[PDB]
Amino acid sequence: TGWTAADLPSFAQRTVVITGANSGLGAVTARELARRGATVIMAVRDTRKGEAAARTMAGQVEVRELDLQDLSSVRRFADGVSGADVLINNAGIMAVPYALTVDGFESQIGTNHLGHFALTNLLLPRLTDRVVTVSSMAHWPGRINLEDLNWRSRRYSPWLAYSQSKLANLLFTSELQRRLTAAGSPLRALAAHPGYSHTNLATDADFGARQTLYAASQDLPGDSFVGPRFGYLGRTQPVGRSRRAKDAGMAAALWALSEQLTKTEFPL
C-alpha cells in the first residue's frame, strides 16, 4: 500500500521551520512532525490564531510571527532562527483579487514565491538538511512574465496569477538545487504538492500534508517533486512537471529577477 504519515521516521532532536497560512495543510504537517519528536517553529501572520491551535498539539509546536507580504518581517523572523534542519515553504494564498504587498509585489507572487525566496536565502547558512517548497497542479498553465512579474501593465487573472506563483515555486527549487550542487553543499531542495485541494476544481488536509511529509522525510534526489500519482489523487511518489518548469534558462533568469526584487542573494 502507499506511503502515509503513519510511516514517518523519527524527527527527535530535529528542528523544522514551517510557514503557515493558519490553514489545515500547514497545521497537519506541523502536527505529524511534532508527534514524531520534531521541534516545530510555525511562522504565521496571525500568531493569536496560531498559538490557540499549537498549544493543544502533541509534541513541540512553537508559534512565531512572520508576514511573507513584508520583507522587513521576513528578515526579522529569519534573524531569530539560530538554526534549523528542514525548512518547509508551505504558506500560500490562492486565486485572490488583485492586491499589492508592502513591497509593491502582486500578492500571490509576492507571498507564495518572493517572500519564500527571501526567507530561504536568509536561512540557508544555518540549515542542515533540506528545503521543501509546496507547489500545485496549477503550475501547469502558468508562465513566468519577466518583464511584468507583478501584473502592473497587464489585465489580472486570479488563477493565472496563482499559476505563475506555483510555477515559480518549481523553478525556484530547480535553480536552488543547481546552486547547492555547484557550491558543494549537502543540502537538498525538493518540492511537493497536495493534489486536488489547491486546484481550480480534516481529510483534505491529511491528504495534502502527506505529500509534503514524504518530501520532508524520505531519501530523495535533489530537485525531486513529490505528489499523488494521478495528480489530483493517487499514491505518494515522485511525479512529473510541466515543460516550462523544466526550462533551466528561465529558472536562472527568474532567480536573478527575484534577487533584485527582494534584495537577497544566494549566500553559499
3-state helix, strand, coil in the chain (%, to 5): 45, 15, 40
Cα 184 to Cα 58: distance, rounded to the nearest angstrom: 37
Q: Record the cell numbers describing residue 75, joined without a space.
A: 528578515
SS (H, E, C) 7-26: HCCCCCCCEEEEECCCCHHH
Residues in the chain: 268
Contact 153, 209 (CB under 8 A): no
Backbone phi, psi, residue 106, to 5°: -60, 140
Contact 87, 132 (CB under 8 A): yes
Instruction: Name the residue among 31, 20, 19 with its Cα closest to residue 56.
Output: 31
Q: Which residues are marked as active site?
A: 162
Cβ count within 10 A of residue 102: 12
Number of domains in the chain: 1
Cα 251 to Cα 245: distance, rounded to the nearest angstrom: 8
- Experimental technique behind these coordinates: X-ray
Cα 74 to Cα 233: distance, rounded to the nearest angstrom: 34
Burial class (CB in 10 A: 0-12, 13-18, 19+), 162: buried
Q: Which residues pair with 43 in a beta bridge?
A: 19, 64
The CATH number of whichever domain residue 268 belongs to comes to 3.40.50.720
Contact 119, 74 (CB under 8 A): yes
Backbone phi, psi, residue 65, to 5°: -80, 130
Type and span of the H or E element at 227: strand 225-228
Type and span of the H or E element at 192: strand 188-192
The torsion region of residue 122 among left (phi > 0), alpha (psi -120 to 50) and beta comes to alpha
Cα 42 to Cα 50: distance, rounded to the nearest angstrom: 8
Contact 61, 54 (CB under 8 A): yes
Domain that holds residue 247: 1-268
